[PDB]
Symmetry: C4
């Protein structure tokens, strides 16, 4: 068993680094099951040459809506749960991580099947905030997924490998994703069906 | 479908901007239904020429009170719920947003009807905090609504329009509000009545 | 009705101020009822000549303890609830405020009667954190209440008065407290008795 | 009774200090009962010569896993509860503290017995964040515990003593731990057995 983090706090990732370069989000989002729950996942890279302290991830849903009373909200915002309640939105970013939003009853995607997906007019804004260790200053990094950039029935390729007592990142695989067996029923629809 | 936010994080709002100017709150507050819930809403503008990171909204109620035991608290403070529990108080401020407080059992306005409104001696302090991207420094912006500045039975005019692959803000409409059909019963009173 | 806070964010407190001086906590703590709940309250002053942004209050209990298994924890720490769950620990500090901890089942003082109070070896550490608007830097302010500095059956003198469209603070009254009718039963004991 | 913290905020620890030196975590972790709950505890030192404001502790579990659907997550991360929900993760660090994670149903260690412990391939990353009072800048401090560094059936030696109206820290005892009677059943196993 080779440590990820040494007793003195220095991580064993990217041999010969020195812990402007900019942080990258995966180009696409995926949906698929993880332990019997349907999930939306995107990937968020690290900064090769420094840590980010008080690092956090949050996501917004951008979708125009009409209230039952006829009020039309263009490009209305609602928060997507990505670990807020358990502090899993508080990141230890020292190699790319797959961020996962479990699609449950409170999730905006609860009623959205595979066929239904591409008819929906929506946008996911991902926002990482944190302090660059060296620089001292507070950073923000943003990206966006529209409908056609969400792939149903996919998983992220792993990028991480153990070489010579250090962990190296295959950055070529970063945006790579592969297909996996996945129901085309909406989360809701799955819950209903499982409940009999 | 035209993106709000590009893959590289740059937003498609205010053509030809450069992302001191000061942030503006709407002059008035409104109350009206949204999906069968009574809501208090005020509007909070963006900063045309920069982002605000770790941006957050909170609101206080300023109202003198006497405790059952006779203790008189002048200008006593209590927090108004504006998304604390779901992280919706964590703002992605890149164009003016209507902030909404759902008037539920825990809300200070639960027992306040339309006729009752203007007899009440109270004040809503709105406070936005966040870090100005460029400047580096932590900002605070404050405003205030007293009773006569809360309009019952109103909605905010939309200010947002899509022009030429960019979203532009009609700042003239910012404080503009329009009337809408709205019960004059207090939230409580509505809950009671609906519960039979 | 005279506003506390003007539409432009400037508060109407301390005529002719300019919004090092140090923040003051009340010298004593009090316990007494507020709306049928027993409460521990201390007071925390403002900074006459500047705001504090992202201002927050928290409190620790310092008390040595033995675990059921015989482990002795000298000067063990536990958090005292002072608004954490409702965001009432997030302060709008523009004049001294009475901070209140409701003594409920989860509170360390739940089983502590008046006679029992002075036999207990304990300490309350109060800690205010926040950013000084002008200065730019993050401040911390600390104080401490030991047993003999907690007054059972008392209330804080009000310090706030309206003079000439401005609110002025009588700083002489700051640490002043007065006696009030108050049961000598522990919170627990009160709950039990009320539950029949 | 000798105060820990004086009325003016200055603590009575380390006679003759001046409130780079680096913060130390205990070299080992321990597991044992505290009030009938099984707990994982590690110790985290203070900075002899300055305070840390907005100080916080969080911990991650690093463990590779396969999802029921066959997805393999190398070095997958999940948050370990160390006071998040009660604000006990918000530290008042003015002398070394034993941080405790109660091993409950939601804890990753719930099903892990003593014999089972050393067969498990896992890592605990501890991360303290906070602002150095003097310096002005945001610090992060990290350390790591792998399986062999977690001692089952142990407790931390106390390091704290009262000498001459001041509290002094025996830093020699810092990583010292002693053995204590402790079941070898997993937390789960204990819950089951107690539930009859
Ligand atoms: Gd901060």
């Amino acid at each position: 068993i080779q440590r990820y983090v040494r007793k003195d706090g220095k991580c064993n990732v990217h041999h010969g680094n020195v812990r402007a370069e900019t942080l990258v989000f995966s180009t696409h989002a995926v949906i698929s099951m993880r332990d019997g729950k349907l999930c939306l996942m995107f990937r968020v890279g690290d900064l090769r040459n420094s840590h980010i302290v008080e690092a956090s991830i949050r996501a917004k849903l951008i979708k125009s809506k009409q209230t039952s009373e006829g009020e039309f909200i263009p490009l209305n915002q609602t928060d997507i749960n990505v670990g807020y309640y358990t502090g899993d939105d508080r990141l230890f970013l020292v190699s790319p991580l797959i961020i996962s939003h479990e699609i449950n009853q409170q999730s905006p995607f609860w009623e959205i099947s595979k066929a239904q997906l591409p008819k929906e007019e929506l946008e996911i804004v991902v926002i990482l905030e944190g302090m660059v260790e060296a620089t001292g200053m507070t950073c923000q990094a943003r990206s966006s997924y529209i409908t056609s950039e969400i792939l149903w029935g996919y998983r992220f390729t792993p990028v991480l490998t153990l070489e010579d007592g250090f962990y190296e990142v295959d950055y070529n695989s970063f945006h790579e994703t592969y297909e996996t067996s996945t129901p085309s029923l909406s989360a809701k629809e799955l819950a209903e069906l499982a409940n009999r």
